[PDB]
Amino acid sequence: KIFKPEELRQALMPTLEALYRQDPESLPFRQPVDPQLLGIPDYFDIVKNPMDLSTIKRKLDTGQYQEPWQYVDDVWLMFNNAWLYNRKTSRVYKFCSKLAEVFEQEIDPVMQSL
Numbered sequence: 668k669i670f671k672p673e674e675l676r677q678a679l680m681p682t683l684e685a686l687y688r689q690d691p692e693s694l695p696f697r698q699p700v701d702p703q704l705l706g707i708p709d710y711f712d713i714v715k716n717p718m719d720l721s722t723i724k725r726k727l728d729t730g731q732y733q734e735p736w737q738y739v740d741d742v743w744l745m746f747n748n749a750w751l752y753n754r755k756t757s758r759v760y761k762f763c764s765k766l767a768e769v770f771e772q773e774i775d776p777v778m779q780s781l
């Protein structure tokens with residue numbers, strides 16, 4: 668079907684806010700990865716399509732999602748990037764796993780409502 672921009676925003680923005688509310692777990696994901704600042708210059712060799720919470724928020728606010736699954740795909744791109752780049756023992760990897768648990772919990776009832 669057809670989704671209006673504000674219908675998508677009202678439904679999906681709370682699920683994004685649920686990720687931001689995870690502290691410390693959302694902190695590595697709030698801004699685009701800056702490999703030079705972080706000392707990890709191999710990042711863009713490994714992660715070809717970067718994604719983060721700030722970019723998803725902007726796309727939601729600017730109507731760049733036409734369907735809910737496009738938003739879900741970006742959130743999952745952010746997760747899969749972090750599980751790919753970071754080691755299983757690292758903070759970022761474990762924080763990613765926590766965010767994915769929280770997102771799964773919140774997005775399910777929202778998809779039902781849409």
Ligand SMILES: CC(=O)N1CCc2c(c(N3CCCc4cc(-c5cnn(C)c5)ccc43)nn2[C@H]2CCOC2)C1
Nearest residue numbers: 691694695696700705706707710748749752753758759
């Ligand atoms: C998402 C992702 O793939 N990244 C690539 C790797 C990475 C990223 C962060 N960042 C991003 C800036 C904010 C941040 C905050 C924390 C934090 C805050 N509070 N606590 C308890 C932890 C941890 C990591 C990060 N560091 N590194 C590595 C460099 C050395 O450390 C690990 C992002």
